[PDB]
Structure formats: structure tokens, C-alpha cells
């Protein structure tokens, strides 16, 4: 054999394809759209906002799963076809040439981090990797504690189409154990966040052969590949490397309408303060957590998704850093084109309708004037507003009964929109007298829009008294 060794850069160099479209997914388009509506169910008000948007995601690090684990190993050969874009690549069978592998892991000298597999197969490369790990845990197992390199991708749960673009075309079968309601998100009854965690201990990478022929046994002809589908329409790739560790999908969701939810979830991932009585604490204290852990082995799903922000922190610490000496499995793989050995990238493009939610709680102010003298109120507040276009404006208001000469037992209750700001209340009292003919009894500003507020004034013209109560 030789000269016949010109499947290399003669058929595999003359392959014609556009590296950046051969692995590109697109979804049907949606014309711009905007929509809103309000409930008024609880004492709350609630607004649901629907808006058209687009997700464009381009990644080279692809996820390992049960359905593809049998086909994912360093050195494996795939066609850059629809099977790879569905994260279910199809093996290119062929009498393979030997290939060399290498591993990170601290220590190792010269070539002890490398191993040569004579007949690359899922089984054979696995045993070759285990054997290379089976011994770094012998020369350096006690000399080094290998941490994990954490990496995650977060996305709001809006639609299956946009979640596939974010996490892979196979997400529907991964996100069944996660009981994503969607209907509840679209109705404003729920907020949900999906996070995919990848804790990497080590990666096995392939030593790029001298030539594309180096990959196949001798006397492998172009026609032999032009018969197993390898061609211009379906050019060949090889698994450049494979990440080993622990991976999982986590569903964060709550029934809160707070707009700080996403920011609070992500702050919990990062291990931050989130302090006793702040608002992030109160959101995370009612966030349902729902984890399903994966890898090679065979995933495993969970059970009933019952967990909280604490379950998360334990699994992180339980997967971060080394596990029971376990691999703990292959979690990700990267492919490269046979031609130039450049990393291939998958591109996803999808339009979707996002849903956003918000709510405010109306407040009440009751004024009980059970005291002598003639009372008099001066109440103001500001309405922060925004037109369509997003331009801001401020319109200040004044109580209908501002400065009215009250008299005996006067009682009334005022209703405030939840989005009122800078509330202002002043109470004066007529004392038939020159010098201080009106006398202030209550003068407070920058009041908090509480659910209920009661201001009780009494006394005489010489010494008016006043008390204040609140309620949430």
C-alpha cells in the first residue's frame, strides 16, 4: 500500500463545503409582536408581557448523553450531517489506523500523559483512557487533589424551540424529567430557569495525525469513503477531545412575580452573600429546585423533583472536586474537521415569543381625626411613568381633599396604585391664635407604600397628639 494512500489531501482535501453552514440550524420566522394584559386577581394586579425575540447560539462543546455515549469517544469519526446536529452522530465505520491520545491531569512527564490506541473503538479507547487514569491515581493520586472546572449555561424557559437552540436539538428528551410547565410560564403564573452544569476534571484530546489518511488503514481508497456517505454533502469530522466529570440539568422555578428572579438564581449559582433580610433571600427561599444528573453511564434521571437552593449547593460541592475516584463520566465532546483539524461549530437560530411578568400591591391610607380643633391635610405623591417608546415622565399628584377644613370626627380611606412613589403627608391644626395659627402635628415624607397605613390624631388645640401604625 502507498500512492493508494491518496484518500488523503486528494479526496479529503478537495472536499467542498462551507464550514459555517454545514452545521447550522434555523427555525421558521416570526414577525415582531408585542402584547400585554392584566389580571387583578389577588389584591395584586399583575401584568403579563409577550414579546418576539430571537436566540442565536453557536457552540463547539457538545453534550454527552445516553443516546450518544456509545458513539462519543476521543478519535471517533463522524459525518457532519443532520445526525451530529441532533447530537446523535453516526459512526463512520472503517478499518482505522492507530491514534495517539493525551490527558491533562497534573504531573506526568514527557509522554507519560499520552497513550496509543491501536484499533480505535468505543470499547478500546475507553479501556485505554481508564488505564491512563488507572495510574495517574498511582504515581500522583496522593500527590494532587484535582478540582473541577465549573461551567454552566443559563436560560429562561420560554419555549421548546428556543431551549433546543440554547441546549441542543435533543433537549426535549432531556427536559422531560424536568416537568417544564410552559403553559404556566405563558400565563404569567410561573417563572422558570434552566441551567446546565458541567464540572470538568480532565479532558482526553487527540493528537492530530500527520495526514487525513492517518486515520484509516492502508489501502483505503477515496471510493471506499464515497460509498459510506462521506463526501461533500456529509464531510467527515473526528472527536478532537472529550471532557470528563459530572453534568446535570437544573430547573429553577417559582410562583413569585418578582423581576429580580433571574438575577437571584444566578447569584445563588455563584455563591454570594444573599443576606438574611434582603429581597434576594426572600425569592430564593421560595424557589423550587429540580436537578437531573447525566453523563455517560446512562443518565439516571431523578425521582420526584423536590429540592431547594440548598439541594443545589450540596450537589455542586458533591460534584465539584473529585468524586469516589469515579471518572465520573464523559460530559462533553468537541469535533474537528478532517481536512484542516479546525474545531467545528454548531449554529442554532430560532425566533420565539418571550413572556414577562410583574405585579404590584395596592396600598391604603386611613385618616381618623378624632380630636378637637379643625384639621387640615396636604398629601402628595409622584407617578413615575414611561410612554410607549420608553421615554420617561413624572406626573405629581395631590389629594382631592388637600387643605379642606375638616371638623369633628373625620374618617376616610385613600386608595393608592401600587407604583406610587415619594408619598407625602402633612397634618396641621387650627388654633385660634396669632403666632402659629396652624401648628404642625405630623409632617413626614418619603413614605413607604405599605399595604395599610393608619394615622390617628387627637388631643386639644394646645397639645395635639398623634400616632402612626403600619401593616403588611
Amino acid at each position: 500500500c502507498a500512492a493508494k494512500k491518496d484518500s488523503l489531501n486528494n479526496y479529503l482535501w478537495d472536499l467542498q463545503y462551507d464550514k459555517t453552514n454545514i452545521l447550522a440550524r434555523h427555525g421558521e420566522t416570526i414577525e415582531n409582536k408585542f402584547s400585554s394584559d392584566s389580571f387583578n386577581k389577588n389584591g395584586e394586579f399583575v401584568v403579563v408581557e409577550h414579546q418576539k425575540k430571537n436566540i442565536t447560539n453557536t457552540t463547539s462543546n457538545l453534550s454527552v448523553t445516553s443516546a450518544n455515549d456509545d458513539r462519543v469517544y476521543p478519535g471517533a469519526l463522524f459525518r457532519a450531517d443532520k445526525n451530529l446536529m441532533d447530537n446523535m452522530p453516526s459512526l463512520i465505520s472503517a478499518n482505522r489506523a492507530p491514534i495517539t491520545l493525551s490527558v491533562d491531569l497534573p504531573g506526568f512527564h514527557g509522554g507519560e500523559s499520552a497513550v496509543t490506541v491501536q484499533r480505535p473503538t468505543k470499547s478500546s479507547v475507553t479501556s485505554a483512557v481508564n488505564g491512563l487514569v488507572s495510574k495517574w491515581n498511582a504515581q500522583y493520586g496522593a500527590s494532587h487533589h484535582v478540582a473541577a472546572r465549573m461551567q454552566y449555561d443559563s436560560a429562561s424557559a420560554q419555549s421548546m424551540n428556543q431551549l433546543k437552540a440554547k441546549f441542543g436539538a435533543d433537549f426535549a428528551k432531556i427536559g422531560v424529567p424536568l416537568k417544564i410547565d410552559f403553559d404556566a410560564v405563558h400565563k404569567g403564573e410561573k417563572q422558570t430557569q434552566i441551567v446546565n452544569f458541567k464540572q470538568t476534571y480532565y479532558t482526553v484530546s487527540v493528537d492530530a495525525p500527520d495526514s487525513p489518511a492517518d486515520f484509516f488503514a492502508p489501502c483505503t481508497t477515496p471510493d471506499s469513503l464515497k460509498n459510506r456517505g462521506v463526501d461533500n454533502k456529509r464531510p467527515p469530522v473526528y472527536v478532537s477531545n472529550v471532557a470528563y466529570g459530572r453534568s446535570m440539568y437544573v430547573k429553577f422555578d417559582t410562583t413569585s412575580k418578582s423581576t429580580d428572579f433571574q438575577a437571584a438564581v444566578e447569584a445563588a449559582i455563584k455563591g454570594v452573600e444573599i443576606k438574611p433580610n434582603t429581597e434576594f433571600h426572600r425569592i430564593l427561599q421560595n424557589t423550587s429546585v429540580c436537578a437531573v444528573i447525566l453523563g455517560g453511564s446512562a443518565n439516571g434521571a431523578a425521582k420526584v423533583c423536590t429540592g431547594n437552593i440548598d439541594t443545589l449547593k450540596a450537589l455542586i460541592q458533591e460534584g465539584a472536586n473529585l468524586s469516589t475516584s469515579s471518572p465520573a463520566v464523559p460530559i462533553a465532546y468537541t469535533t474537528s474537521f478532517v481536512k484542516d483539524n479546525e474545531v467545528a461549530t454548531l449554529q442554532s437560530n430560532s425566533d420565539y415569543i418571550e413572556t414577562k411578568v410583574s405585579s404590584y400591591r395596592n396600598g391604603y391610607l386611613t385618616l381618623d381625626h378624632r380630636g378637637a380643633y379643625v384639621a387640615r391635610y396636604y398629601i402628595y405623591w409622584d407617578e413615575y411613568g414611561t410612554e410607549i417608546d420608553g421615554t420617561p415622565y413624572v406626573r405629581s399628584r395631590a389629594w382631592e381633599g388637600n387643605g379642606k377644613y375638616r371638623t369633628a370626627h373625620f374618617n376616610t380611606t385613600i386608595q393608592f396604585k401600587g407604583n406610587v412613589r415619594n408619598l407625602r403627608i402633612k397634618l396641621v391644626e387650627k388654633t385660634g391664635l396669632v403666632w402659629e395659627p396652624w401648628r404642625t402635628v405630623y409632617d413626614r415624607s418619603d413614605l413607604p407604600l405599605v399595604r395599610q397605613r393608619t394615622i390617628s390624631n387627637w388631643g386639644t388645640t394646645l397639645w395635639p397628639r398623634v400616632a402612626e401604625t403600619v401593616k403588611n
Binding site: 409622584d382 415622565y393 413624572v394 405629581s396 387643605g403 415619594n422 415624607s445
Partner: protein, 78 residues
């Protein structure tokens, strides 16, 4: 930078428009009792305390915006 009704004295019918200076980014119309103000303003001063003090009006209602000639009197309920 921005066009708005600016009358240096209170008038019920402010009709004079001016291209406000760089110093001003918003516009104000206020009804203090029986007086009406219209002038170039700063959004950071579109609070009760600032308008009260800067116009010497104990009780008032005010409105602020950033569109040209937006601060007309019909913007407040009166």
C-alpha cells in the same frame, strides 16, 4: 438639544418656546395654587422638594418630560 416652553415669570398662557441649553435635559410645567410655571428644567430636580424650593411655592402639582414642547398646561389636571 431640547425645545420647551420657557416663561421667566408665572403666566396662565405661556406661549414662548426656546431651544433649552445644554444644562437642561427635561422640561417642567407646574401649577402652584393659582400660578403656572413653564421652563427648561433638569430631570434630577423633578421632585416635590426641589420644585417647591426653587419656585418658592408651598403647595403645588408638577409634571416633567423630555419631548419637545411637551410641558403644556393641559398636562396637569388643574
Amino acid at each position: 438639544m431640547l425645545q420647551c416652553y420657557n416663561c421667566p415669570n408665572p403666566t396662565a398662557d405661556c406661549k414662548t418656546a426656546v431651544n433649552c441649553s445644554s444644562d437642561f435635559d427635561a422640561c417642567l410645567i407646574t401649577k402652584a395654587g393659582l400660578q403656572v410655571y413653564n421652563k427648561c428644567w433638569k430631570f434630577e430636580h423633578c421632585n416635590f422638594n426641589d420644585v417647591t424650593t426653587r419656585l418658592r411655592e408651598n403647595e403645588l402639582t408638577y409634571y416633567c418630560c423630555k419631548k419637545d414642547l411637551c410641558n403644556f398646561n393641559e398636562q396637569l389636571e388643574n
